[PDB]
Structure formats: C-alpha cells, structure tokens
mmCIF file of C-alpha atoms (C1' of nucleotides) and ligand atoms in Angstrom:
data_model
loop_
_atom_site.group_PDB
_atom_site.id
_atom_site.type_symbol
_atom_site.label_atom_id
_atom_site.label_comp_id
_atom_site.label_asym_id
_atom_site.label_seq_id
_atom_site.Cartn_x
_atom_site.Cartn_y
_atom_site.Cartn_z
ATOM 1 C CA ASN A 1 0.000 0.000 0.000
ATOM 2 C CA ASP A 2 2.838 2.406 0.883
ATOM 3 C CA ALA A 3 5.713 1.617 -1.475
ATOM 4 C CA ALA A 4 5.779 4.579 -3.848
ATOM 5 C CA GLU A 5 5.927 6.817 -0.778
ATOM 6 C CA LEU A 6 8.925 4.904 0.573
ATOM 7 C CA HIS A 7 10.673 4.934 -2.807
ATOM 8 C CA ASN A 8 10.172 8.695 -3.142
ATOM 9 C CA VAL A 9 12.240 9.014 0.045
ATOM 10 C CA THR A 10 14.849 6.221 -0.242
ATOM 11 C CA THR A 11 15.207 5.704 -4.018
ATOM 12 C CA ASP A 12 16.486 2.192 -3.269
ATOM 13 C CA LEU A 13 14.518 -0.879 -4.306
ATOM 14 C CA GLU A 14 16.306 -3.036 -1.730
ATOM 15 C CA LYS A 15 14.922 -1.102 1.233
ATOM 16 C CA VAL A 16 11.437 -0.986 -0.289
ATOM 17 C CA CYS A 17 11.414 -4.753 -0.817
ATOM 18 C CA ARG A 18 12.921 -5.648 2.567
ATOM 19 C CA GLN A 19 11.020 -3.292 4.869
ATOM 20 C CA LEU A 20 7.685 -3.781 3.073
ATOM 21 C CA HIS A 21 7.735 -7.575 2.918
ATOM 22 C CA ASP A 22 4.537 -8.288 4.867
ATOM 23 C CA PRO A 23 1.560 -6.416 3.348
ATOM 24 C CA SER A 24 -0.197 -6.203 6.716
ATOM 25 C CA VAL A 25 2.789 -4.608 8.473
ATOM 26 C CA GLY A 26 3.207 -1.003 7.352
ATOM 27 C CA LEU A 27 5.619 1.825 8.097
ATOM 28 C CA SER A 28 4.634 4.168 10.917
ATOM 29 C CA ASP A 29 6.267 7.307 9.501
ATOM 30 C CA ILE A 30 8.360 7.792 6.359
ATOM 31 C CA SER A 31 10.511 10.889 5.917
ATOM 32 C CA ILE A 32 13.805 12.046 4.450
ATOM 33 C CA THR A 33 16.736 10.279 6.105
ATOM 34 C CA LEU A 34 20.449 11.000 6.056
ATOM 35 C CA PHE A 35 22.461 9.369 3.260
ATOM 36 C CA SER A 36 19.258 8.359 1.449
ATOM 37 C CA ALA A 37 18.451 10.038 -1.852
ATOM 38 C CA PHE A 38 15.017 11.639 -2.117
ATOM 39 C CA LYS A 39 13.272 12.516 -5.357
ATOM 40 C CA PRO A 40 13.577 16.311 -5.687
ATOM 41 C CA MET A 41 10.569 18.605 -5.739
ATOM 42 C CA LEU A 42 9.937 19.921 -9.249
ATOM 43 C CA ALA A 43 8.160 22.921 -10.762
ATOM 44 C CA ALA A 44 5.217 23.366 -13.122
ATOM 45 C CA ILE A 45 4.685 25.793 -15.982
ATOM 46 C CA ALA A 46 2.844 29.006 -15.123
ATOM 47 C CA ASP A 47 0.518 31.212 -17.161
ATOM 48 C CA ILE A 48 1.402 34.756 -16.157
ATOM 49 C CA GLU A 49 -2.215 35.949 -16.165
ATOM 50 C CA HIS A 50 -3.372 33.708 -13.294
ATOM 51 C CA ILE A 51 -0.103 33.823 -11.334
ATOM 52 C CA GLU A 52 -1.793 35.498 -8.369
ATOM 53 C CA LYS A 53 -4.526 32.856 -8.334
ATOM 54 C CA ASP A 54 -1.785 30.218 -8.232
ATOM 55 C CA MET A 55 -0.326 31.872 -5.110
ATOM 56 C CA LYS A 56 -3.682 32.028 -3.278
ATOM 57 C CA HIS A 57 -3.706 35.837 -3.456
ATOM 58 C CA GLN A 58 -0.747 36.249 -1.107
ATOM 59 C CA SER A 59 2.877 37.310 -1.242
ATOM 60 C CA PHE A 60 5.253 35.081 -3.179
ATOM 61 C CA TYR A 61 8.968 34.711 -3.859
ATOM 62 C CA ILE A 62 10.560 35.447 -7.237
ATOM 63 C CA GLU A 63 14.023 34.073 -7.993
ATOM 64 C CA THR A 64 16.281 33.483 -10.977
ATOM 65 C CA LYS A 65 16.555 30.102 -12.688
ATOM 66 C CA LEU A 66 20.086 28.710 -12.901
ATOM 67 C CA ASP A 67 21.482 26.696 -15.821
ATOM 68 C CA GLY A 68 23.305 23.753 -14.318
ATOM 69 C CA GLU A 69 22.931 20.403 -12.637
ATOM 70 C CA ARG A 70 20.683 19.585 -9.691
ATOM 71 C CA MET A 71 22.411 18.204 -6.617
ATOM 72 C "C1'" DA B 1 122.108 -49.215 -61.125
ATOM 73 C "C1'" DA B 2 117.070 -50.657 -59.935
ATOM 74 C "C1'" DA B 3 113.174 -51.135 -56.606
ATOM 75 C "C1'" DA B 4 110.520 -49.938 -52.226
ATOM 76 C "C1'" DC B 5 109.133 -46.590 -48.724
ATOM 77 C "C1'" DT B 6 107.929 -41.929 -47.465
ATOM 78 C "C1'" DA B 7 107.180 -36.436 -47.851
ATOM 79 C "C1'" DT B 8 104.770 -32.618 -49.778
ATOM 80 C "C1'" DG B 9 101.564 -30.294 -52.888
ATOM 81 C "C1'" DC B 10 97.161 -30.206 -54.889
ATOM 82 C "C1'" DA B 11 92.452 -31.693 -56.215
ATOM 83 C "C1'" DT B 12 88.033 -33.026 -54.230
ATOM 84 C "C1'" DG B 13 83.850 -33.343 -51.352
ATOM 85 C "C1'" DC B 14 81.317 -32.106 -47.356
ATOM 86 C "C1'" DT B 15 80.303 -29.153 -43.317
ATOM 87 C "C1'" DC B 16 79.959 -24.869 -40.960
ATOM 88 C "C1'" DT B 17 79.581 -19.663 -40.318
ATOM 89 C "C1'" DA B 18 78.372 -14.186 -42.191
ATOM 90 C "C1'" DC B 19 75.497 -11.193 -45.309
ATOM 91 C "C1'" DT B 20 71.516 -9.677 -48.325
ATOM 92 C "C1'" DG B 21 66.634 -9.810 -49.527
ATOM 93 C "C1'" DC B 22 61.491 -11.229 -48.839
ATOM 94 C "C1'" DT B 23 57.564 -12.119 -45.600
ATOM 95 C "C1'" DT B 24 55.142 -11.709 -41.293
ATOM 96 C "C1'" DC B 25 54.341 -9.994 -36.494
ATOM 97 C "C1'" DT B 26 54.191 -6.321 -33.116
ATOM 98 C "C1'" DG B 27 53.959 -1.529 -31.510
ATOM 99 C "C1'" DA B 28 52.565 3.138 -32.042
ATOM 100 C "C1'" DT B 29 49.605 6.626 -33.939
ATOM 101 C "C1'" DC B 30 45.464 8.741 -35.777
ATOM 102 C "C1'" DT B 31 40.503 8.863 -36.826
ATOM 103 C "C1'" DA B 32 35.772 7.583 -36.217
ATOM 104 C "C1'" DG B 33 32.139 6.119 -33.316
ATOM 105 C "C1'" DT B 34 29.450 4.712 -28.739
ATOM 106 C "C1'" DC B 35 27.654 5.412 -24.045
ATOM 107 C "C1'" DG B 36 26.324 7.900 -19.232
ATOM 108 C "C1'" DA B 37 24.259 11.386 -17.486
ATOM 109 C "C1'" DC B 38 22.892 16.006 -17.210
ATOM 110 C "C1'" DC B 39 20.068 19.706 -19.157
HETATM 111 O O1 LIG C 1 12.599 22.922 -16.771
HETATM 112 P P1 LIG C 1 12.858 22.095 -15.538
HETATM 113 O O2 LIG C 1 11.697 21.243 -15.097
HETATM 114 O O3 LIG C 1 14.182 21.382 -15.534
HETATM 115 O O4 LIG C 1 13.008 23.174 -14.379
HETATM 116 C C1 LIG C 1 13.257 22.776 -13.041
HETATM 117 C C2 LIG C 1 14.735 22.715 -12.756
HETATM 118 O O5 LIG C 1 15.278 24.048 -12.686
HETATM 119 C C3 LIG C 1 16.450 24.033 -11.908
HETATM 120 N N1 LIG C 1 16.443 25.203 -11.011
HETATM 121 C C4 LIG C 1 17.226 26.278 -11.183
HETATM 122 N N2 LIG C 1 17.009 27.196 -10.212
HETATM 123 C C5 LIG C 1 16.069 26.703 -9.395
HETATM 124 C C6 LIG C 1 15.382 27.165 -8.178
HETATM 125 N N3 LIG C 1 15.672 28.367 -7.633
HETATM 126 N N4 LIG C 1 14.461 26.350 -7.632
HETATM 127 C C7 LIG C 1 14.167 25.152 -8.165
HETATM 128 N N5 LIG C 1 14.756 24.676 -9.273
HETATM 129 C C8 LIG C 1 15.700 25.389 -9.922
HETATM 130 C C9 LIG C 1 16.506 22.699 -11.156
HETATM 131 O O6 LIG C 1 17.531 21.904 -11.734
HETATM 132 C C10 LIG C 1 15.124 22.103 -11.426
HETATM 133 O O7 LIG C 1 15.105 20.688 -11.456
HETATM 134 MG MG1 LIG C 2 18.511 23.315 -15.506
#
DNA sequence: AAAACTATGCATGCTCTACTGCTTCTGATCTAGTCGACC
C-alpha cells in the first residue's frame, strides 16, 4: 500500500522490498533520512495571467533560474 | 744401377659460419564512433 511513498524518500529498491515484505505490516512514519536520496521537488509551468490565483492571493517569492545540474 | 718406402703439394667433397633480400608480427599513432548522465 505504501511503497511509492517509501521509494520517493529512499530511491532504493532493496529497502522498499525488505522493509515492506509483509503487506499487513506497514511503516509508521516515512521521511527524508540522512544518506538516502530523495526525489527532488519539481516545478510546473505558469501562465502569467493567473499567477496570483496560483499563489492564493498572497505574497510570493521570485528568484532566478540557474542553468546547471541539480544536486 | 734398380726397386721400395715416405714427404709434400694439390684436387676433391662435405660441413659450418656471415650477409643480403622477402615475408610476417608487433607496436605506435590517428581517426571515427558509442555510451552515461545532465540539461
Ligand atoms: O525545466 P525544468 O523542469 O528542468 O526546471 C526545473 C529545474 O530548474 C532548476 N532550477 C534552477 N534554479 C532553481 C530554483 N531556484 N528552484 C528550483 N529549481 C531550480 C533545477 O535543476 C530544477 O530541477
Ligand atoms: Mg537546468
């Protein structure tokens, strides 16, 4: 039931298959752990007209986009 | 004076050791292409 969630945090099939061996027994809490790769949060295209509606009519942060690798 | 034994030179074959030329193997180099991973 909770395997995609664990893989989004560990990115290691071995841990997913070992920890989640019994379907009945789940994982109490799954979160980013040290020395375990986590799938980075990505960004979606924006239509400038509705930008405010996308920010729930509140303040937002503007930053520059950098041309390089993600680490 | 005549005959028998021996010495030395030379021809002859076979065997062994350098030098030139052809063929093949290795090393080194360059050029073209593939793959990982990102975006
Ligand atoms: O087009 P895309 O989906 O790759 O864009 C997202 C990527 O953009 C890079 N990036 C650069 N600067 C930022 C900031 N400030 N925040 C988030 N992402 C940023 C990342 O590499 C990202 O995956
Ligand atoms: Mg980028």
